[PDB]
Amino acid sequence: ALFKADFEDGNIGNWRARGTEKLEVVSGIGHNSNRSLKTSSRSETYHGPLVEVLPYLQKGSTVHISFWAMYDEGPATQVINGSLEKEFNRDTANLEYAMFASTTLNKGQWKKIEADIIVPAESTGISGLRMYAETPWKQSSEVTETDTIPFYVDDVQITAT
Ligand SMILES: OC[C@H]1O[C@@H](O[C@H]2[C@H](O)[C@@H](O)[C@H](O)O[C@@H]2CO)[C@H](O)[C@@H](O)[C@@H]1O
Ligand SMILES: [Ca+2]
C-alpha cells in the first residue's frame, strides 16, 4: 500500500476538516476494528474528512483508492461520495474538486467506496491532491438535515496499479 489509515493507534494524523465541522478519532466504533474517524457538526454537504495524499504518490501515475464508510442516524439510506481536492501552482484561491466514487449506504452498515484515480503529471503544476468524503452536493439554501448527517470512515487505502 502507498497509504493506509486504520486509526487503530488513535491518531488524527494529517486528517482535517474542510470547513467548520468536527473530526474525532473515536473508540468502540470501527470497520471490523475498534477505532475510526468520525465527522460531525457538518453544516454543508461538502463538510467531511480530508487528507493530503500527493506526497505519497508519483505524479502521472494511476492509483487505486478505497475506504469504508458508515452512518448510524437519520435516513434509512444515504449516498456518500469519495472525492478529490486539487491545487495547482500553490494557488489556494482556485481549487478544483472531483468525485471519484459514490455508493448508497444503508443506515448502520459499513460499505466500501473505491475507484482508480489519476494523479496529474508534474507538468500540470499540481501542488496538492487531497482525498475526502462528503455527501452529494446541494446549495446551502437547499441543504437539509439528512444531507449533513455525521458519518464514520475507516480502512483508507491507496494502492499501486
Ligand atoms: O459546488 C462546487 C464544489 O464546492 C466545494 O466546496 C467548497 C465551496 O464551494 C467553497 O465556496 C468553500 O469556501 O470551500 C468549499 C470546500 O471546503 C465542494 O467541496 C465540492 O464537493 C463541490 O463539488
Ligand atoms: Ca479502524
Side-chain angles (χ1 to χ4, degrees):
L2 313 178
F3 174 76
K4 271 186 168 145
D6 64 20
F7 304 101
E8 293 306 309
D9 60 5
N11 293 319
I12 195 71
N14 298 127
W15 292 87
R16 65 163 181 79
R18 306 187 68 233
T20 52
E21 78 278 29
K22 180 172 203 289
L23 272 66
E24 189 181 351
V25 181
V26 297
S27 67
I29 301 282
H31 175 57
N32 301 145
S33 76
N34 219 298
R35 304 212 179 209
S36 65
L37 175 58
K38 188 180 195 185
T39 305
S40 63
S41 281
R42 302 175 65 233
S43 62
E44 303 291 351
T45 58
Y46 54 83
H47 287 173
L50 177 145
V51 68
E52 176 73 66
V53 295
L54 190 57
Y56 297 98
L57 314 179
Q58 179 178 188
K59 292 172 188 164
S61 66
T62 296
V63 301
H64 191 69
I65 302 187
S66 59
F67 66 98
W68 289 81
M70 185 271 288
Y71 78 100
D72 63 12
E73 77 183 53
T77 70
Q78 174 59 54
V79 174
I80 299 289
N81 294 339
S83 297
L84 305 176
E85 176 180 289
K86 292 197 230 71
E87 182 197 273
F88 296 82
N89 306 121
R90 322 207 148 285
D91 184 2
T92 62
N94 288 295
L95 301 180
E96 326 190 338
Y97 313 100
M99 187 192 308
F100 64 82
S102 180
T103 81
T104 292
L105 289 82
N106 300 128
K107 177 150 74 161
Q109 74 168 13
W110 290 91
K111 195 171 180 179
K112 191 179 191 171
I113 291 96
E114 67 183 325
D116 282 3
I117 64 109
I118 283 148
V119 186
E122 172 63 36
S123 51
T124 60
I126 184 86
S127 59
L129 183 59
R130 306 113 190 196
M131 182 206 100
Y132 69 102
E134 64 176 342
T135 49
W137 192 87
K138 285 198 170 58
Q139 64 184 88
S140 206
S141 52
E142 261 186 285
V143 169
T144 83
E145 161 188 337
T146 202
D147 300 303
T148 54
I149 47 137
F151 66 87
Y152 306 83
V153 301
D154 204 0
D155 286 342
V156 182
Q157 191 169 297
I158 307 180
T159 290
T161 60

Short mmCIF file of all heavy atoms in Angstrom, two decimals, residues 18-19 45-47 83 85 97 132 134-135 137, ligand 1:
data_model
loop_
_atom_site.label_atom_id
_atom_site.label_comp_id
_atom_site.label_asym_id
_atom_site.label_seq_id
_atom_site.Cartn_x
_atom_site.Cartn_y
_atom_site.Cartn_z
N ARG A 18 -12.83 20.36 6.32
CA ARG A 18 -12.83 21.29 5.19
C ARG A 18 -13.44 22.67 5.51
O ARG A 18 -13.14 23.65 4.85
CB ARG A 18 -13.55 20.65 4.01
CG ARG A 18 -12.95 19.29 3.68
CD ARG A 18 -13.53 18.72 2.41
NE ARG A 18 -13.08 19.54 1.30
CZ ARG A 18 -13.86 20.09 0.39
NH1 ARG A 18 -15.17 19.90 0.38
NH2 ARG A 18 -13.32 20.82 -0.57
N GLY A 19 -14.28 22.71 6.52
CA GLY A 19 -14.87 23.97 6.99
C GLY A 19 -14.91 24.03 8.51
O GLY A 19 -13.90 23.84 9.16
N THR A 45 -22.85 20.07 2.67
CA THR A 45 -22.69 18.74 2.07
C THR A 45 -21.22 18.40 1.86
O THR A 45 -20.83 17.24 1.92
CB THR A 45 -23.41 18.59 0.72
OG1 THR A 45 -22.92 19.57 -0.21
CG2 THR A 45 -24.89 18.76 0.88
N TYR A 46 -20.44 19.44 1.64
CA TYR A 46 -19.02 19.29 1.35
C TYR A 46 -18.13 19.26 2.59
O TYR A 46 -16.93 19.16 2.49
CB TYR A 46 -18.55 20.36 0.38
CG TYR A 46 -18.85 21.77 0.78
CD1 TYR A 46 -18.03 22.47 1.66
CD2 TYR A 46 -19.96 22.42 0.23
CE1 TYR A 46 -18.32 23.80 2.01
CE2 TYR A 46 -20.26 23.73 0.58
CZ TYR A 46 -19.44 24.41 1.45
OH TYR A 46 -19.77 25.71 1.74
N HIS A 47 -18.73 19.32 3.77
CA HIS A 47 -18.02 19.04 5.01
C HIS A 47 -17.78 17.55 5.10
O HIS A 47 -18.69 16.74 4.83
CB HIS A 47 -18.81 19.52 6.21
CG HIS A 47 -18.82 21.01 6.36
ND1 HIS A 47 -19.59 21.64 7.31
CD2 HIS A 47 -18.16 21.99 5.70
CE1 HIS A 47 -19.40 22.95 7.23
NE2 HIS A 47 -18.54 23.18 6.27
N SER A 83 -14.11 11.89 -2.92
CA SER A 83 -13.76 12.99 -3.81
C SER A 83 -12.31 13.44 -3.66
O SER A 83 -11.64 13.08 -2.69
CB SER A 83 -14.67 14.20 -3.59
OG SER A 83 -16.01 13.90 -3.90
N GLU A 85 -9.71 16.93 -3.84
CA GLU A 85 -9.48 18.37 -3.89
C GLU A 85 -8.10 18.55 -4.44
O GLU A 85 -7.12 18.00 -3.89
CB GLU A 85 -9.58 18.98 -2.50
CG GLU A 85 -9.26 20.47 -2.41
CD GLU A 85 -9.40 20.98 -0.99
OE1 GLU A 85 -10.53 21.07 -0.50
OE2 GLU A 85 -8.36 21.25 -0.35
N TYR A 97 -12.35 20.33 -7.64
CA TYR A 97 -12.97 19.25 -6.89
C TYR A 97 -13.53 18.25 -7.86
O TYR A 97 -14.11 18.64 -8.90
CB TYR A 97 -14.10 19.77 -6.00
CG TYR A 97 -13.69 20.99 -5.23
CD1 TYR A 97 -14.06 22.26 -5.66
CD2 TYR A 97 -12.93 20.88 -4.07
CE1 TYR A 97 -13.65 23.39 -4.98
CE2 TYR A 97 -12.56 22.02 -3.37
CZ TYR A 97 -12.91 23.27 -3.83
OH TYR A 97 -12.55 24.42 -3.15
N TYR A 132 -11.10 13.18 0.13
CA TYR A 132 -12.11 13.47 1.15
C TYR A 132 -13.41 12.72 0.87
O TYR A 132 -13.64 12.21 -0.23
CB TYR A 132 -12.34 14.95 1.35
CG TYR A 132 -13.01 15.68 0.23
CD1 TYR A 132 -14.36 16.02 0.28
CD2 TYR A 132 -12.28 16.12 -0.86
CE1 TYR A 132 -14.96 16.73 -0.73
CE2 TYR A 132 -12.88 16.80 -1.90
CZ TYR A 132 -14.21 17.11 -1.82
OH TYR A 132 -14.74 17.81 -2.89
N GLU A 134 -17.71 13.02 1.47
CA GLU A 134 -18.74 14.05 1.57
C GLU A 134 -20.08 13.44 1.16
O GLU A 134 -20.15 12.28 0.81
CB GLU A 134 -18.41 15.23 0.65
CG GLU A 134 -18.41 14.87 -0.82
CD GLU A 134 -18.18 16.04 -1.76
OE1 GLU A 134 -18.33 17.23 -1.37
OE2 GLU A 134 -17.86 15.75 -2.92
N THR A 135 -21.15 14.21 1.26
CA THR A 135 -22.44 13.80 0.72
C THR A 135 -22.70 14.57 -0.56
O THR A 135 -22.04 15.59 -0.78
CB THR A 135 -23.60 13.98 1.75
OG1 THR A 135 -23.54 15.28 2.33
CG2 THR A 135 -23.47 12.95 2.85
N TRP A 137 -23.68 17.05 -3.45
CA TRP A 137 -23.77 18.49 -3.42
C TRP A 137 -25.20 19.02 -3.45
O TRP A 137 -26.05 18.52 -4.18
CB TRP A 137 -22.95 19.13 -4.53
CG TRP A 137 -22.83 20.64 -4.28
CD1 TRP A 137 -21.89 21.32 -3.52
CD2 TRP A 137 -23.75 21.63 -4.73
NE1 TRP A 137 -22.16 22.67 -3.52
CE2 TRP A 137 -23.30 22.89 -4.26
CE3 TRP A 137 -24.90 21.57 -5.52
CZ2 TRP A 137 -23.97 24.08 -4.55
CZ3 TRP A 137 -25.58 22.75 -5.81
CH2 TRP A 137 -25.10 23.99 -5.33
O1 LIG B 1 -20.17 23.36 -5.82
C1 LIG B 1 -18.80 23.11 -6.16
C2 LIG B 1 -17.95 22.31 -5.12
O2 LIG B 1 -17.83 23.09 -3.91
C3 LIG B 1 -16.86 22.62 -2.98
O3 LIG B 1 -16.89 23.24 -1.67
C4 LIG B 1 -16.18 24.47 -1.43
C5 LIG B 1 -17.17 25.60 -1.55
O4 LIG B 1 -17.79 25.56 -2.84
C6 LIG B 1 -16.43 26.90 -1.28
O5 LIG B 1 -17.24 28.04 -1.62
C7 LIG B 1 -15.94 26.87 0.18
O6 LIG B 1 -15.43 28.15 0.60
O7 LIG B 1 -14.97 25.80 0.30
C8 LIG B 1 -15.57 24.52 0.00
C9 LIG B 1 -14.59 23.40 0.20
O8 LIG B 1 -14.16 23.22 1.54
C10 LIG B 1 -17.19 21.17 -2.66
O9 LIG B 1 -16.12 20.66 -1.89
C11 LIG B 1 -17.44 20.23 -3.82
O10 LIG B 1 -17.92 18.96 -3.32
C12 LIG B 1 -18.42 20.87 -4.80
O11 LIG B 1 -18.49 20.00 -5.94
#
